[PDB]
Symmetry: C5
Subunit: 320 residues, 5 copies
């Protein structure tokens, strides 16, 4: 019932072996204490007892001068990436540019490349959806917006905020290592494993310089990603403001038209009150007149028109 | 009538003893002046006369190379935590990973763990309530929102702001110690209590390194908590914007429908004015006609329909 | 007609003497140039020619190793504070914890304590007013808010912004001194006045350490005050957002009810148009029928009900 | 056709001479290359070949150990300031406090004083206008705001933003010089012009100290100005929020009153439909009844009142 | 099928030659590895193996002590700039002020000048469009805004945000080089290509000083551009707020007028209900009266006027 790790091991030749190992046995083999392998912090890079420990969300890796270990990889869809790219990248002529360099350089480059590719894929998925939703929402010919698109935009905005947080954490973790030279020196595990051998093995090539160059490359890539995400957020905010203004303008137009119709209706009712009063069954001295009916009707209609025009002019003066 | 402290003392063996002591007697025993134990600042960590003084809101602790003291603990529901975890953690094989290290390491680790657990519990309580309230509020099928949920959201937002302030203060206090090596050296109270003994007692193990590792661990945990809180705040703001847009859209739809009905009513009244005028009790030359009544009624109805259709077309053209 | 200062002098024994002195005479006595005592900057702390010059808004003080001077104190309600606390604090067993330390320590502590008490009093006055105003304004059962409370809230917000600016300036002034050790060394005026005497007078006590401790204490107090003010501002903003949402929801509810009533009125007018048409004084072939009147009335009422129900169903479908 | 400068020269005696000089001749006389005198950057202070070059928007100055030059001064209303203050300030007992110091101190002090006075005048002009406009706009007894005041407020806000940018640039330029001691040493042009002479001429007075004091003074003044501008901006934002809330409340009140009147009108029309139906010219069996007319009228009126009261109660229950 | 570069080469004499070269051949000739010429990062300036590599969006350049290379220039409208300015600038008396300096100074100055001119042109294009659109939108005499101008403003705001991001990146890239002296020393490729020759060739002129001056110039220009862009953004936000307030005020005015007309209509209908009731065909005891008709009509009209005036007074009291 002892806790165990599902370990995938890649040697210097690219060979891959998957098995399970007890936690205590792994601690004894790697020469590390338990507190080293807690993996409590997301996106942490550390060097303990000449071994590199890396965590990136769901990816947990341990780098040694002899081999690389991936821990707790199941149910993450990582099998395709592992078994189709890592043997080629570590022990081949793939996209890695650190082949003459020791193994740890290739391992770190592969891990950083995988994470940066994941982030780039997330952003490339997010961008078109947000762009098309914003384009649909800011259509000026729509009286009211579609609420399903609003919900979709809210979900995409939450996803974008999470992605931006991930990018910021990735940048900070790299920059912290880059700032201090001691960490860069510690990262060269092969050099410090056998210092006597590498004192003469290194043919004038500076391992710290190579590590700094690689980390600077990946930091710049992450910075570009962060800039793109920030621009997307700003665009979302501007589109929201434009939507608000459009809705207000539509409301104003509808209100003005309704007001004009109300003025017309009020004038019509006011001048029909005369006919209503004449319609009651009471005695009067105007029944005998012949032209009185047409005269009253004409006065009613002409006065309705004149008062409506006067009211419209008053409204125009008020609204300037 | 002299002021006193309610002191809970844990020795190196985990034994717990609770009593009361006069302030002057405590000052004399600990070798500290009164100004040292004012506890004026919330979340302060200091080292005075080779003794550590810590305050975290309602928790006041003094760490010595021989024992630990908790001050003013009553009416805080801390008795359960104290008497059920501290004897086990300090003098056992619990979650602490600093058992071979001196006592102050275990004490600091226990206090930091308790505070970080409190913060994590607060956040884990807050998150589902805010999430479900936001999900209920952004329902697009609701014409108007529920105000009780609004009040609940306001209270939860205030609580979240307070929690974020607490996390920021906790991060700053730790980072200030971590920046300077002198404070880290001072924190090793056991080493400086008997420097001659620990000059040879330390079997190549660096106490400052262990202190730095522990503080870095807790700082990273606090940073993760702060990131989660910030993401929650951003989500709240986005949900508020979505709610505003939804309310505006509903208002626009209702206004448009009301306008259309107003146009219909105005047309009906305008064409009924003809019947009202014909209804007055005045003489006319059109009474003898037979088909005039049906002709007038048909003209009224057909014209009402035509003018309503024309007005609707005008509205559609205006709103595009 | 020469410009003069109203000077209040406190000696090392706490005795207080108030008088007036010409500016040139004061410059000659204190050994300072005119440009030193311009007091142009609010909240400035400086050391010139072994004399400390301090300004905090309306408070102007000069600290010397022998005595303290307060300048331009009239018409500021400071007489009570001066004559009731300063003689006790400077030459007594009051709240000051720097009695064995030289005079300048007591003077600086008293001035900083007075300013921090003023800021705390301002915040403690401001907080309940804003809290109760916000509680009154966010009442969900009010159709519209009270504008007098809005004006009160605006005034209180302006006051809070001014207080926050004052706290920020106070923090910055202290932190600038705390950052550099040269300023801390200069602040010990008694030590540098007679360096030969204090070379042996100091019995192993570090004046710079005491000054650093005092300044750190007051900086922490100011930081706590700033945190409280920022939390209050955030609460105000959240309450404003909640008020906006409540007003929008009330408007939507009223608009929906008005729309339903408009639909009912339109249906009633449409079906009463039939009676209006039948009411005109024109010949027809339906007068002889007996049950035609009740039949028309029943059709009118039943159709009004049916069309109103259909319109309400249409509105419900539109609003989902 | 060679480009020329309109040069105003002030000697150490305050004498002023205005003329024009070719650019190449000026370069040869001042011992500077062309690229030095491009004046491309607004608010730049530099030292080249032991000569100080300063630009502040429209003011271009060159300071030498022997004299000061102002370049391109025409059509700027600077003639009054130049010919009425500079001869007095440079060679008199005016507001300058650096008379015993060399000429460059007086020149720099005069230029900085002029610029800070310009900024203070701009702020003192801006503040009352914005304050009175905001006071007029936030009047709670106004149903709608005045749009001309809105335009005035917009113009004043743009001016305030420009002024704040100018203050920030002025602060940054001074702080950059203050941070590095090399620039402060370079600024003492008189000392470096004849180092052998000033090696013994300086009677224990530190020129760098005086320069630091002067620059710190002007930096503090600029900081105070920036704080005032920021407070004004915050006040403007708060006033805008209050205006929004007031407008929303007025709209809600008007909408509620309109709704109540609509309910009354609908009830009246509904109960008048009965009279309209009775008014048609159709046969019925209720004509012979005497009290039927008064009975119908009384039922109509009483029912109108009762249904209006019921509807108002329903509205009150809905709005709570 | 090997990948190739379209290379434009400028020698020290300004002669230009365009051709194509395989990537491997270019790597071998320039003495650089493949990873050096990936050009993955936008706006990157680096020095590798005594060769400068620069990328600015679509511009890719390699600077050597002997010649300059532009890579992948087709389909970018850069042919005009290249063939009409670069031969003159590099080998002539043009705007460059670094003619006596080595070739790399002229090359870097030309590239930086081109980029800063591009940014200035973009801003000068953007500013008038945004200014005129904002002026048109904030017209207080317009009841509703024009939505096409809103779309134009949204597009221009997106363009401005992109431009501001570009300016920020350009500033950061320059400042990073300016901060460290090692990079400035590395930038002097001619000095390090033949250190023995330039140890005596340099006649007391400091190449690092010249590089620092040039980079500081361009950094200041970029800072001015960034300030202008930020001011434009602030102006846009203020204009949006003013537009919101104007729309709200117009809505309030229209609503008030509609409410007054509704009150009048309700009064008219209420007092016409009397005539409607009198109009029904039912027996009554008031037919014989003569003056009853005129009396009822006069009471109806006078009461309508009085109740309308009372209602208007009530509305005025409610709105204060
Ligand atoms: Cl509205």
């Amino acid at each position: 019932v002892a806790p165990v790790f599902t370990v995938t091991k890649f040697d210097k030749q690219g060979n891959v072996t998957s098995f399970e190992r007890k936690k205590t046995e792994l601690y004894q083999e790697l020469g590390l204490q338990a507190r080293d392998l807690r993996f409590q912090h997301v996106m942490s890079i550390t060097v303990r007892n000449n071994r590199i420990i890396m965590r990136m969300e769901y990816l947990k890796a341990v780098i040694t001068p002899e081999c690389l270990l991936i821990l707790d990889y199941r149910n993450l869809n990582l099998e395709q990436w592992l078994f189709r790219e890592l043997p080629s990248q570590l022990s081949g002529e793939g996209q890695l540019v650190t082949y003459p360099l020791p193994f740890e350089f290739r391992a770190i480059e592969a891990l950083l490349q995988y994470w940066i590719n994941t982030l780039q894929g997330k952003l490339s998925i997010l961008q078109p959806l947000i762009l098309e939703t914003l384009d649909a929402l800011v259509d000026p010919k729509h009286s009211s917006v579609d609420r399903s698109k609003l919900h979709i935009l809210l979900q995409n905005g939450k996803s974008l905020s999470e992605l931006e947080t991930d990018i910021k954490i990735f940048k900070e973790s790299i920059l912290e290592i880059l700032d201090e030279e001691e960490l860069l020196e510690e990262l060269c595990v092969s050099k410090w494993s056998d210092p006597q051998v590498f004192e003469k093995s290194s043919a004038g090539i500076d391992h710290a310089e190579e590590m700094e160059l690689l980390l600077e490359n990946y930091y710049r890539l992450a910075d570009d990603l962060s800039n793109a995400a920030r621009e997307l957020r700003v665009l979302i905010d501007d589109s929201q403001s434009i939507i608000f203004i459009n809705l207000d303008s539509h409301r104003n137009v509808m209100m003005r038209l309704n007001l004009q119709l109300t003025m017309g209706t009020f004038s019509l009712s006011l001048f029909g009150l005369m006919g209503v009063a004449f319609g009651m069954n009471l005695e009067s001295s105007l029944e005998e007149d012949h032209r009185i009916f047409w005269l009253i009707t004409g006065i009613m209609f002409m006065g309705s028109g004149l008062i409506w025009r006067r009211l419209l002019s008053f409204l125009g003066r008020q609204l300037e």
